[PDB]
Homo-oligomer: A and B are copies of this chain.
């Protein structure tokens, strides 16, 4: 406590009653003539001190400071995801205890926990003889951490692993799990530091905190500054000289991450660190967004309209990919305007995105695989693929990523529908070229071949299937025909009912002869068949026969409606067939006028058929809650409907204070 060291790198005096030795060192480092005055041994000592202070990043005193720059460089394979290089280094013959300590960290990182445990035990055995206190202490710590991880993993796998994986997985044997349990009996990490020789205690006190059950409590408590609002009206700026709360917090986070990763400490895989990173990043993003909003409100939108409060780079992207789940990223997105945040160093994040693709292809194309490594890898892969939406990518990288995602990713964590949303997020920044269109066609062909078996059936969590893929491919390419699917159609036969229906779903992608042959296998004979075809089968136009069927149905329902007036009884209803016809007529799908005679049965039907004379006192605002963008625009266009909808929306917004109705009102009708 003789001085203060600041994250900017400048040192200040504090509570020191003596000679300012640090100031003299800085002057000596500044004066090459003062250095030559020193002795030879002192010269070598000064050179070593200068090298150390330079690597650490201490520059000079605060008063002699200036426009100091800052950058983050973590020189560790664990933070670069260089799996092949790590494996090759493991395969090498460790030349030193330091080569053995890094190798054990890599082995634990790669999922071979037992091998890492053995290596750590060997290093602990050798260190005490070697008189390497630091490595001995850190290896004890890491071995205990690995043991805790092993026990928790065993419990998790034996509890729920057998279900999610579809089969009980035995990552660890029984004799080894007994051996570790017998070795680590009554072992207490708490006293590890106190038993050391007092020279080690006097020297390496700064490492004692690695023995505590929890650290980073002061770092988490210091986050409260980022939430202050008074600073916005008037920012004191007294937290640090030349830096604000954002800068100090971010630099502290970088220092923590660098210290934990560059020394190969096996604490970077526990829940506390993940929570710390999540909290810090989320608070920083929220503060930046709030500052931008306040600046926009205060001055004109011409200034700060899209200011970049929290700029994202390679380090930020990798940290968010590694330390966030899907739900956390969703919360971050809904909380803030991510699209407004530009991303820097795209070539690096792109390399990481296409680099995550190669590793996943290796993992799942090959039969061999590690359970723990897969568990810790798939979350990162999914997070990175989700967050790659806002990043521009090259054609080759996009194609490789698309292939890896579509073909090599296990259905276990994705689905027809789950995969679809992933692709569309990629399409919003890089419009579909021909290469990935061909890849999508190949995927569709494969999943079409999958339908030959009777028992095969697609499963989706959001109702999205290959039909959507066929729609997407056509959206970007109006004129497209799949020759492979066309020849599949031309070789089709009646008994292939599953394939017949699945291909009916993909009718637009076919050729003329193929689609003629397919439609020769099905027909419509009733209003129910017509609706089934429109839903599945893609009936494009309402032929006069279809309208005649509709008219017959409405007249039959008119007779039934008269008999219902006679009854005065109505048990229940499920789906209104009439409202669909009314909206179709409103959309100019049914050109006949006979349906106008059958008016007065359903309020929605009358409203959508004859808006001008409709009694708007019968209108239900909840009806608006189901209409889609196209229908909302069409309704807004209509003059007879616009002002009544405006009034009902105004009343609902004033009273209900519901955000959905307000959003509709601002988006479409005003």
Contacts and interface: CB of A to CB of B under 8 A. Distances in A.
A620 B300 contact: yes
A622 interface: yes
Contacts of A657: 293
B653 A618 contact: no
Q: How large is the interface on A (under 10, 10 to 19, 20 to 34, 35 or more residues)?
A: 20 to 34
Contact of A650 (B617, B621, B653, B666): B666
A23 interface: no
B656 A297 contact: yes
Interface in A635-655: 646, 648, 650-655
A646 B670 CA distance: 9
A190 interface: no
- The number of times this chain is found in the oligomer is 2
A620 B298 contact: yes
Contacts of A617: 300-302
A221 interface: no
Nearest to A650: B666
A299 interface: yes
A302 B655 contact: no
Contacts of A297: 621-622, 652, 655-656, 658
Nearest to A619: B300
Contact of A666 (B618, B621, B653): B653
Contacts of A135: none
A296 interface: yes
A591 B658 CA distance: 46
Nearest to A648: B301
Contacts of A296: 655
Interface in A604-644: 617-622
Contact of A293 (B622, B655, B666, B670): B655
A572 to B, nearest CB: 13
A354 to B, nearest CB: 28
Contacts of A620: 298-300
A652 to B, nearest CB: 7
Interface string A305-317: 0000000000000
Interface string A456-477: 0000000000000000000000
A618 B302 contact: yes
Contact of A651 (B301, B621, B650, B654): B301
Contacts of A656: 293, 297
Contacts of A650: 666, 670
Contacts of A621: 297, 301
B622 A298 contact: yes
A651 B662 CA distance: 14
A658 B650 CA distance: 16
Given A293-B657, A657-B293, A670-B670, A300 B652 contact: no
A617 B654 CA distance: 30
Contacts of A622: 297-298
Contacts of A666: 650, 653-654
A505 B627 CA distance: 59
Nearest to A337: B655
Interface in A132-189: none
A545 to B, nearest CB: 37
A474 B655 CA distance: 36
Interface in A251-310: 293, 296-302
Given A650-B670, A666-B650, A300 B618 contact: yes
Contacts of A646: 670
Nearest to A646: B670
Contacts of A298: 620, 622
Task: Tell me which of A293, A300, A653 has the highest count of chain B C-beta atoms within 10 A of its own C-beta.
Answer: A300
Nearest to A661: B297
Nearest to A302: B617
Nearest to A296: B655
Q: Which of A301, A302, A619, A670 has the most CB of B within 10 A?
A: A301
Contacts of A619: 300-301
Contacts of A670: 646, 650, 670
A657 B650 CA distance: 16
Contacts of A655: 293, 296-297
Nearest to A653: B666
Nearest to A615: B302
Nearest to A289: B655
A288 to B, nearest CB: 14
A662 B662 CA distance: 10
A340 to B, nearest CB: 10
Interface in A437-488: none
A621 B653 CA distance: 22
Nearest to A621: B297
A339 to B, nearest CB: 13
Nearest to A603: B300
A650 to B, nearest CB: 6
Contacts of A293: 655-657
A662 B655 CA distance: 13
A646 to B, nearest CB: 8
A667 to B, nearest CB: 9
A652 B662 CA distance: 14
A291 to B, nearest CB: 13
A370 to B, nearest CB: 26
Contacts of A652: 297
Interface of A: 293, 296-302, 617-622, 646, 648, 650-658, 662, 666, 670
Given A293-B657, A296-B655, A297-B658, 7 more contacts: A298-B620, A298-B622, A300-B618, A301-B617, A301-B648, A650-B666, A662-B662
8 contacts: A298-B620, A300-B619, A301-B619, A301-B621, A301-B648, A301-B651, A646-B670, A670-B670
Which 6 pairs show the lowest CB-CB distances between chains A and B? A302-B617, A300-B620, A300-B618, A650-B666, A297-B656, A293-B655
